[PDB]
Amino acid sequence: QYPVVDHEFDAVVVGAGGAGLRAAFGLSEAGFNTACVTKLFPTRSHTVAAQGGINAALGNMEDDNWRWHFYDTVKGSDWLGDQDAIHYMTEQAPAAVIELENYGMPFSRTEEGKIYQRAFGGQSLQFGKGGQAHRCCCVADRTGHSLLHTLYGRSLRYDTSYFVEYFALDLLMENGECRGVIALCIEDGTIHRFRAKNTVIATGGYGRTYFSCTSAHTSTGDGTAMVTRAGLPCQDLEFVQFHPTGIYGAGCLITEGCRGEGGILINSQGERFMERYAPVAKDLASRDVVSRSMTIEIREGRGCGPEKDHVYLQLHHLPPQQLATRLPGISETAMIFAGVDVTKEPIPVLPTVHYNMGGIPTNYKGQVITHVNGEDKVVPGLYACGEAASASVHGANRLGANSLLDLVVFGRACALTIAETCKPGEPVPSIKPNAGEESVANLDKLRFADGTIRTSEARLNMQKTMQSHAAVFRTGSILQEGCEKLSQIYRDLAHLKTFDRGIVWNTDLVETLELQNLMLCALQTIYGAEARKESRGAHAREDYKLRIDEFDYSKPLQGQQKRPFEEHWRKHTLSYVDVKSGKVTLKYRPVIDRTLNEEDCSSVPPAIRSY
Amino acid sequence: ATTAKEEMARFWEKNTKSSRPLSPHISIYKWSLPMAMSITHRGTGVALSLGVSLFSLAALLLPEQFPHYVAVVKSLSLSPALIYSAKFALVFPLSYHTWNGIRHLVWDMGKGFKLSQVEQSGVVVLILTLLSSAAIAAM
Amino acid sequence: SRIKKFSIYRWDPDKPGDKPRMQTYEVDLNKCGPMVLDALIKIKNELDSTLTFRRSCREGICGSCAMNIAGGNTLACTKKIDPDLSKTTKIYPLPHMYVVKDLVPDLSNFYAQYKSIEPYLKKKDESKQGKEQYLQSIEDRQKLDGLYECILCACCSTSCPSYWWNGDKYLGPAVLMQAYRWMIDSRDDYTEERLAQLQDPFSLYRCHTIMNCTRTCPKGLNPGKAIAEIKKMMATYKE
Amino acid sequence: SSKAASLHWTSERAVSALLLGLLPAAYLYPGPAVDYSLAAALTLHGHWGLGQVITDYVHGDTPIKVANTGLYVLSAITFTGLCYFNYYDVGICKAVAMLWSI
Numbered sequence A: 001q002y003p004v005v006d007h008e009f010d011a012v013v014v015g016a017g018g019a020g021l022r023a024a025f026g027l028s029e030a031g032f033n034t035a036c037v038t039k040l041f042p043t044r045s046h047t048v049a050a051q052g053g054i055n056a057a058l059g060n061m062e063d064d065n066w067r068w069h070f071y072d073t074v075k076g077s078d079w080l081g082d083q084d085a086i087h088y089m090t091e092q093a094p095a096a097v098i099e100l101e102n103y104g105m106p107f108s109r110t111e112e113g114k115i116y117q118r119a120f121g122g123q124s125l126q127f128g129k130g131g132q133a134h135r136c137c138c139v140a141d142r143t144g145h146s147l148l149h150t151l152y153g154r155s156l157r158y159d160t161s162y163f164v165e166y167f168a169l170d171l172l173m174e175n176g177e178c179r180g181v182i183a184l185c186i187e188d189g190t191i192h193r194f195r196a197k198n199t200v201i202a203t204g205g206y207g208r209t210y211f212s213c214t215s216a217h218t219s220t221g222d223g224t225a226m227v228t229r230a231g232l233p234c235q236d237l238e239f240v241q242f243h244p245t246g247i248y249g250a251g252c253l254i255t256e257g258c259r260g261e262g263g264i265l266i267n268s269q270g271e272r273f274m275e276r277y278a279p280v281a282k283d284l285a286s287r288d289v290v291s292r293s294m295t296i297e298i299r300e301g302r303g304c305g306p307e308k309d310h311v312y313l314q315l316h317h318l319p320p321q322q323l324a325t326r327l328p329g330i331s332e333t334a335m336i337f338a339g340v341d342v343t344k345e346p347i348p349v350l351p352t353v354h355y356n357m358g359g360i361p362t363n364y365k366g367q368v369i370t371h372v373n374g375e376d377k378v379v380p381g382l383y384a385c386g387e388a389a390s391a392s393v394h395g396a397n398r399l400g401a402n403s404l405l406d407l408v409v410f411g412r413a414c415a416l417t418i419a420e421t422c423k424p425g426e427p428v429p430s431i432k433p434n435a436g437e438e439s440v441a442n443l444d445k446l447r448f449a450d451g452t453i454r455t456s457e458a459r460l461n462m463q464k465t466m467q468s469h470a471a472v473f474r475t476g477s478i479l480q481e482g483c484e485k486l487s488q489i490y491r492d493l494a495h496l497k498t499f500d501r502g503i504v505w506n507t508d509l510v511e512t513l514e515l516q517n518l519m520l521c522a523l524q525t526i527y528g529a530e531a532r533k534e535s536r537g538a539h540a541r542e543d544y545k546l547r548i549d550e551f552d553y554s555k556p557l558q559g560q561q562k563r564p565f566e567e568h569w570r571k572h573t574l575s576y577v578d579v580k581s582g583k584v585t586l587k588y589r590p591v592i593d594r595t596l597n598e599e600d601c602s603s604v605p606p607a608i609r610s611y
Numbered sequence B: 001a002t003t004a005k006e007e008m009a010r011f012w013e014k015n016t017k018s019s020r021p022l023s024p025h026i027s028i029y030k031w032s033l034p035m036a037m038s039i040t041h042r043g044t045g046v047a048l049s050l051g052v053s054l055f056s057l058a059a060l061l062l063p064e065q066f067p068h069y070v071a072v073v074k075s076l077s078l079s080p081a082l083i084y085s086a087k088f089a090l091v092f093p094l095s096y097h098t099w100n101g102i103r104h105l106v107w108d109m110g111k112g113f114k115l116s117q118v119e120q121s122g123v124v125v126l127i128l129t130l131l132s133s134a135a136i137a138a139m
Numbered sequence C: 001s002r003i004k005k006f007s008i009y010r011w012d013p014d015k016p017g018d019k020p021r022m023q024t025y026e027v028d029l030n031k032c033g034p035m036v037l038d039a040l041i042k043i044k045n046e047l048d049s050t051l052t053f054r055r056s057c058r059e060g061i062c063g064s065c066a067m068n069i070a071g072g073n074t075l076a077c078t079k080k081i082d083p084d085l086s087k088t089t090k091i092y093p094l095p096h097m098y099v100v101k102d103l104v105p106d107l108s109n110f111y112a113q114y115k116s117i118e119p120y121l122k123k124k125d126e127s128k129q130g131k132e133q134y135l136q137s138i139e140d141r142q143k144l145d146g147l148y149e150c151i152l153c154a155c156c157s158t159s160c161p162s163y164w165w166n167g168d169k170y171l172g173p174a175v176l177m178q179a180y181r182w183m184i185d186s187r188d189d190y191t192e193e194r195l196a197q198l199q200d201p202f203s204l205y206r207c208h209t210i211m212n213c214t215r216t217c218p219k220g221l222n223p224g225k226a227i228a229e230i231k232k233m234m235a236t237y238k239e
Numbered sequence D: 001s002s003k004a005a006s007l008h009w010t011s012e013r014a015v016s017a018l019l020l021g022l023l024p025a026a027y028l029y030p031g032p033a034v035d036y037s038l039a040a041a042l043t044l045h046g047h048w049g050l051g052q053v054i055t056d057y058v059h060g061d062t063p064i065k066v067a068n069t070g071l072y073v074l075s076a077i078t079f080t081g082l083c084y085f086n087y088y089d090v091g092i093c094k095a096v097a098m099l100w101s102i
């Protein structure tokens, strides 16, 4: 009933945001015949909406050292980050940003002609002792737009075969190896199997499990879900980042560059409240700490607006020419979506779901891993990079301007590793003749679904459930109810209702597939949250307020009984879902503390984390 | 793995043989004054040319010469208001095309592209077209 | 309750012999976001989940939701709903485009024309690519403002009658402004070759300065002015 | 040249500007020099301008070749008749003045 079209490549990249673009043409540039399969035209990816910039220790504003950026990221992650991946990312950052400027990215400039860099949340000089760092390279406040448009333009010079507006449904697995992906061509309603020696998942995040997020409508966890349907684990999915400043109402992002350029957060009584919560960093503390701070001010009666449910971002004390040159994007957006003139009045802002720290777990080379009997094992043929991956460079909390860096650093890493591991033209592995057949059965089931609960209503019940049960502060009783409500909504998917029986541009159908995918991510997120009985980074448990490591790092380690791996929480969550029942199983694997080169860059032991 | 030229060719090949409709355009698009004035510049330009070509054909083909036809016309003793209409109608497209031609020559230097100045310069073209036409039709 | 009517272009490729039509929907503005995209999503979620359109970012940065709202090409997500309840808002696909389904046009010629201008940095000596950041002064970077901000939504080009009549050979204002963005990038070494590519009767010279492009731009850019600067460069450059 | 399209655009603008100066010239210094300059400038500008209309609106290699060929004939007959009128009749400037005295 569905004509299946079969393709053969050396490599298939799923996703055409910043990470997938970089991986895809990087692969073609190494001589690999590469398909890039994307559900959106590439410049529409959520990466296009990024604003504040991309970190790299170029030293254009002061003397810098990538090792300070390494340290900031490790402390930023609250010691759930893998220090080998953070070493790779931060050491690679100067060459990666320079690669982008040489492609033609129109970076803002300094008086010396070099790339302008601003201050940004949680970055410091001298290993946390030297004052605020200025290493966030930016194109005004549209860095992601230019990043993506430059990567897309650069990709046109290469033989990469693009499959635009194709929706990947599942991976083709055989004996624990990925053999490619299966997808639906939205433009004409046909099914396509992409066989390839290597498959790269770069599908973005899943902010749309929540009711208010900064993310595009298209951030639906699609690659994450395919990994879950493959019986593979995802990692750290309970770790969701609330950006301090989504605009009240539509949820649109207002960049942390506003605070990096001088803007300040104020409450109803005009207090710059961050001076009380984080006396050193102030409005440039880490995002988990700023978002928790704002959330405390609102629930303690200092919310702004007629409902006492947001706070203010003040920019008007800053010179108007600085706003025009450094923050033109949010100046328009504050007018359109708030009717605010940033030179006269503050922007109403509140913490809003923004970024997923967890994802498909990988090693520092981008290779997807599983974990079996205490040992990490690479999944042959399968790579992930970008917000859909958990390398993990971000741990429990991502520093602003580190995601765009992750995209280009690990997108290229995936390409470099395939090139050092495989050769072009190697015989693409065969699949059984019926491979992917179950993906089509599910599609046909949803396309003709005629139950009691239309897709928009089931999605809404998921988003409001996540919003009120898996928010900035969490507790066990409330998480447990969110787990119970979510599992019921998962079962009630058997009652789904769709109306569009076509197959060409059936977004009624495509959004029902995305719903299934969001549901798998959300089940893993909230069940992992309920199990994690500690507070770390963005995961704050008011019934378990302390961070629980293998030692108490607040006192000297001399004479301490190390805690067994099962009795502490400095470990990655590994989540699996039985897709038929919706039952979530959880395991744990150790954080990697070794760097790539101890003499070049010391492992940073865990410590009290305060801004 | 497709050049741009191949991409454009496949687009036309795919679409022209498809059942896909062409979305509406001129029948549904909102007019503005600059847009109306742009097409009137073309229409008055074509009209002036077709008037020049007809005049040129009549010089080659009509058995009498111009002063005879002017005499014939005056012998009809037409009303001054009707003479004024005919002169205004003859001079109006020339006046329009001329003043708007000047506006075009200004654009070709790169000046006047702010959308508010496109509007100012068009309204300016309209009042000069009226003033010069009525002054010349009075002559 | 404040019932507002939208009349939306409908065409289904999977219904044999289906003819394009308009369908009216009624939306209570007190239960809807302020933008037209909010009404489109509300209709799809609540009244007719067969209504099909493109969208992603919902904040005017991705360019996905370009369409013709009340006679003008715009982005549904930044276009305020007209609260005059005595007026019906007509919504059409971007004009003079092949319709894939409902409000979804085929943009692949528009993308192929953008590919054809090589919208990426080009240096005569590219062997140094990756070593050091290229130097660009603050002033020469300021020349890119108004040009790099384009989201490639196609609103301008699908508003241009010259592109309607000759969109096969005329690059249109979106692509021409991006050509100028690379022509005046001080780091790019191919200015002459980029001008030389437009030495034919159609690629650039179908522009007759109508200025629908600049009126319609949801980013407030001026593709009409950028085209005039190309023309001046075309007539002045030596080989 | 390899710059044929830009040279044509520049020439179109120069002829427009010349024709614009002929209008003050016809009113101030009417006579044979103006009459033939108007004959040449009016024919050239309309020939180029009508060619842009053909380029915009006429499609297909044969209809394009037919429209452009018909236009050369229209233009060549136009210029001959205007020169005819200037030589054997009162000429353009005098005709306009005679018309306006009606």
Ligand SMILES: *Cc1cc2c(cc1C)nc1c(=O)[nH]c(=O)nc-1n2C[C@H](O)[C@H](O)[C@H](O)COP(=O)(O)OP(=O)(O)OC[C@H]1O[C@@H](n2cnc3c(N)ncnc32)[C@H](O)[C@@H]1O
Pocket (backbone or CB within 6 Å): A014, A015, A016, A017, A018, A019, A020, A037, A038, A039, A040, A041, A042, A045, A046, A047, A048, A049, A050, A051, A052, A053, A054, A143, A144, A166, A167, A168, A169, A202, A203, A204, A205, A214, A215, A216, A219, A222, A223, A253, A354, A355, A385, A386, A387, A388, A400, A401, A402, A403, A404, A405, A407
């Ligand atoms: C939301 C956001 C994030 C953001 C930001 C501003 C906003 C509003 N500003 C940032 C900044 O200034 N600096 C920074 O470091 N990060 C910033 N972020 C976070 C960051 O932008 C994102 O995490 C990052 O851009 C994500 O990039 P990635 O390349 O991983 O993914 P994406 O751009 O979201 O694109 C997803 C691609 O995958 C394709 N896809 C998705 N599902 C499918 C299926 N089923 N089949 C095929 N393809 C699929 C999409 O088409 C898209 O191309």
Ligand SMILES: CCCCCCCCCCCO[C@@H]1O[C@H](CO)[C@@H](O[C@H]2O[C@H](CO)[C@@H](O)[C@H](O)[C@H]2O)[C@H](O)[C@H]1O
Pocket (backbone or CB within 6 Å): B031, B032, B033, B034, B036, B037, B040, B096, B119
């Ligand atoms: C020879 C004379 C030839 C020209 C005369 C022909 C008559 C012209 C008719 C078309 C005029 O149509 C009218 O133009 C004006 C001015 O651009 C438009 O107004 C425009 O500018 C105003 C003011 O900034 C905006 O508020 C408005 O959103 C915009 O549409 C109006 O929406 C359109 O409806």
Ligand SMILES: O=C(O)/C=C(\O)C(=O)O
Pocket (backbone or CB within 6 Å): A050, A051, A052, A053, A243, A253, A254, A255, A256, A257, A355, A399, A400, A401, A402, A403, A404
């Ligand atoms: O996510 C980031 O790294 C940064 C932002 O979202 C920002 O621009 O504020």
Ligand code: SF4
Pocket (backbone or CB within 6 Å): C149, C150, C151, C152, C153, C154, C155, C156, C157, C173, C174, C177, C216, C217, C218, C219, C220, C221, C223
């Ligand atoms: S110039 Fe404006 S209207 Fe045209 S494609 Fe770019 S953003 Fe869209």
Ligand code: F3S
Pocket (backbone or CB within 6 Å): C159, C160, C161, C162, C163, C172, C173, C206, C207, C208, C209, C210, C211, C212, C213, C214, C223, C224, C227
């Ligand atoms: S509307 Fe079209 S004619 Fe030129 S000025 Fe704009 S590209």
Ligand code: FES
Pocket (backbone or CB within 6 Å): C054, C055, C056, C057, C058, C059, C060, C061, C062, C063, C064, C065, C066, C075, C076, C077, C078
């Ligand atoms: S949805 Fe991105 S521009 Fe409207």
Ligand SMILES: [K+]
Pocket (backbone or CB within 6 Å): A356, A357, A358, A359, A386, A387, A388, A389, A390
């Ligand atoms: K992640």
Ligand SMILES: [K+]
Pocket (backbone or CB within 6 Å): C182, C183, C184, C185, C186, C187, C188, C189, C191
């Ligand atoms: K240059």
